């Protein structure tokens, strides 16, 4: 497997013969150098239709480099989002197969620049189309991130509702009866409090509210963990007196409407929160994974286009360049880079930052 192994793509003119191992056939010399690095590679190229001017070619190359950077950033963001959703199980990258094949198997072929991508237009048009597709994929990823944020907010609201028995925001914790069911106009006959200390203090507060606040009535108690709590009976003709007694009792009152409409609204909110969380964690996750695979394919195609553009700029026309696959061992990246630097017997315009090879791009 070795899915974590890095990838460095390269290309060279057909007449090339590297000076690292003089006298060896180009494919044979590459393989021996690859064998020197214990590596492997295969041809992967598509003849583009770009015949634009040198200035047009340079502008297209700059735009392609920018688009490749953007596509790589989008792919990394999608991979990070998937890993957050516990999708990147084996590894943060290359774990998810693409086009019903693992990452190296997909890299073992580059015929994707056909049909669905072969616009047969200039390189600028294909680059713009790929950029638009990448932007659409990024928009889908952003929508998935927004759904995940909404799911997180819903989960936080649910946790706040179920934070604890004391100061509980979940009206379902209180029974439907003894909760102002069929409340009278002049007497609500219900109140909720969560006093501190023992329940005896709550009874005294109820005893304090038992006079001049509401006619004597009984209501159930609540646990509220160690802090005391109890449903209370409060009148509406003297609702101000009951509220004042609750405030002055230092019992941290938390009374609220326990009508059927409130219970239905709370149940609907909980159901919507659960549904949104499940949707974002399953359907949005699968859509994001598919979009990440598509974005990886598109980024590979864009990298191929950029490599072709560079091979038309660095190396000279007519197009006869031969590309090589990016496969390399996980720990042989430095040795492969050194070997490529030694073999780069061309492009002397640099000092006697960009690689002096005809094409050199490291991925993942």
């Amino acid at each position: 497997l070795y899915t974590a192994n890095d990838f460095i793509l390269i290309s060279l003119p057909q007449n090339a013969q590297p000076v690292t191992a003089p006298g060896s056939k180009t494919d044979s010399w590459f393989n021996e150098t690859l064998i020197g690095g214990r590596a492997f590679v295969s041809d992967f190229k598509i003849p583009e239709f770009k015949i634009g001017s040198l200035d047009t070619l340079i502008v297209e190359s700059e735009e392609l480099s920018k688009v490749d950077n953007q596509i790589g950033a989008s792919i990394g963001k999608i991979i990070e989002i998937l890993q957050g959703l516990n999708e990147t199980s084996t590894n943060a990258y290359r774990t998810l197969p693409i086009n019903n094949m693992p990452v190296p198997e997909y890299l073992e072929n580059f015929q994707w620049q056909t049909r669905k991508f072969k616009l047969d237009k200039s390189i600028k048009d294909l680059i713009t189309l790929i950029s638009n597709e990448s932007s659409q994929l990024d928009a889908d990823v952003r929508a998935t991130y927004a759904n995940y944020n909404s799911a997180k907010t819903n989960l936080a609201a649910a946790e706040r509702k179920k934070t604890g028995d004391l100061s509980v925001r979940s009206l379902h914790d209180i029974v439907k009866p003894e909760d102002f069911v069929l409340n009278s106009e002049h007497l609500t006959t219900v109140l909720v409090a969560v006093p501190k200390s023992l329940k005896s203090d709550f009874e005294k507060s109820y005893e304090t509210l038992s006079k001049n606040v509401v006619p004597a009535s009984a209501s159930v108690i609540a646990e509220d963990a160690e802090y005391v709590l109890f449903n209370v009976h409060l009148f509406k003709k003297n609702v101000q007196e009951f509220t004042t007694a609750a405030r002055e009792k230092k019992f941290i009152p938390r009374e609220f409407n326990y009508s059927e409409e409130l219970i239905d609204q709370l149940k609907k909110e909980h159901d919507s929160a659960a549904s949104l969380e499940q949707s974002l964690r399953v359907q949005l996750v699968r859509l994001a994974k598919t979009a990440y695979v598509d974005v990886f394919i598109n980024w590979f195609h864009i990298k191929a286009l950029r490599v072709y553009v560079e091979s038309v700029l660095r190396y000279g026309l007519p197009p006869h360049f031969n590309i090589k696959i990016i496969a390399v061992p996980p720990k042989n990246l430095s040795k492969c880079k050194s070997e490529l630097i030694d073999a780069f017997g061309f492009l002397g315009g640099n000092a006697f930052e960009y690689e002096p090879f005809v094409m050199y791009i490291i991925n993942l």
């Binding site: 706040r160 004391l166 100061s167 405030r247 230092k250 941290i252």
Partner: protein, 343 residues
């Protein structure tokens, strides 16, 4: 910390008693569900604040009045504690006061570059950073006259002599350079004073917390300077706080950074700050870390750092009250849960 109670035992006791008055998470939840600002005042009166705000009418109540009155109570408490402090503890609280005297003097040089008005600035100058000669410093019309008014007879002397020349601050912008560099010098001097004249564990729970203050200042400088290319990196290096976990290794890369991505690369470099700026806004995470460090400052018993922990905890507690008051008065209750409570 056996010797700590010879001079600061009563002060420590009073500060801890004040800490017992900090709004718990249940108190914040109760304040959150307040229908209107007047109901918020009514529910707040049940707390240690009590009838502090009853002196004003209900219709006159506003979020600015909420902040003014609660911060006035905070400042009364701090002034009482400082007045009942002695020796190195008084110097430590004096240092705290200089922390805001920096801002007051920086505000005062504004309105002296352009001497349009006075007096109203003194009214706006919050009292936590007050000094006796500030009214005298107000009358100085010329910027240079105010410079020697603050170069001597004020505790601002070492910072001004440290990195400023009398004609230099005319060109420098007050916010971008003048106040930030003064905070810089303040932080090195305060960290040095702590390393010299403090007892353990107040030692450690000051270096860590002042290092966090320096780190937040550095992060704000790095993430604000990118929008203004006029600040060259070498001055930025002269502007970074020189203290904290970032220094030495990170602050250099933050100074040399020229974009958000570079600051991200140089910022997620250290542990406590991965994902710290990636998600959400800086202010909320910075305040959360500040509350975490303050809570720890309260885990210690015989440490003078409880004064600083109480100051910052009570300031962020009034900030949370004002945030809730705004979310209620503006009816923006959808983001009322941005308050940070660690009690």
């Amino acid at each position: 910390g056996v010797y700590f109670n010879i001079d600061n035992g009563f002060i420590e006791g009073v500060v801890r008693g004040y800490r017992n008055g900090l709004l718990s998470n249940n108190q914040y939840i109760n304040l959150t569900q307040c229908d209107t600002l007047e109901d918020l005042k009514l529910q707040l009166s049940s707390t240690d604040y009590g009838n502090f705000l009853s002196s004003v009418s209900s219709e006159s109540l506003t979020t600015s009045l909420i902040q003014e009155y609660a911060s006035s109570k905070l400042y009364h408490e701090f002034n009482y504690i400082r007045d009942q402090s002695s020796g190195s503890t008084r110097k430590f609280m004096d240092y705290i006061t200089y922390g805001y005297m920096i801002d007051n003097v920086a505000l005062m040089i504004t309105g002296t570059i352009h001497d349009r008005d006075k007096g109203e600035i003194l009214q706006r100058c919050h009292p936590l950073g007050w000094f006796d000669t500030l009214p005298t410093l107000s009358v100085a019309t010329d910027l240079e006259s105010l410079y020697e008014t603050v170069l001597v007879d004020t505790p601002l002397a070492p910072y001004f002599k440290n990195c400023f020349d009398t004609a230099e601050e005319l060109d420098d912008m007050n916010i971008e350079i003048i106040r930030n560099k003064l905070y810089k010098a303040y932080l090195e001097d305060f960290y040095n004073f702590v390393t010299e004249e403090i007892p353990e564990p107040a030692k450690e729970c000051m270096q860590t917390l002042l290092g966090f203050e320096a780190d937040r200042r550095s992060i704000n400088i790095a993430l604000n300077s990118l929008q203004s290319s006029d600040i060259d990196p070498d001055l930025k290096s002269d502007l970074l706080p020189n203290i904290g976990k970032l220094y030495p290794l990170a602050t250099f890369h933050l100074a040399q950074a020229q974009d958000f991505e570079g600051v991200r690369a140089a910022l997620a470099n250290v542990y406590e700050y991965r994902g710290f700026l990636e998600t959400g806004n800086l202010e909320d995470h910075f305040y959360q870390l500040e509350m975490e460090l303050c809570r720890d400052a309260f885990t210690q018993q015989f440490a003078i750092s409880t004064v600083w922990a109480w100051m910052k905890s009570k300031e962020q507690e009034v900030r949370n009250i004002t945030w809730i008051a705004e979310c209620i008065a503006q009816n923006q209750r959808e983001r009322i849960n941005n308050y940070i409570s660690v009690y």
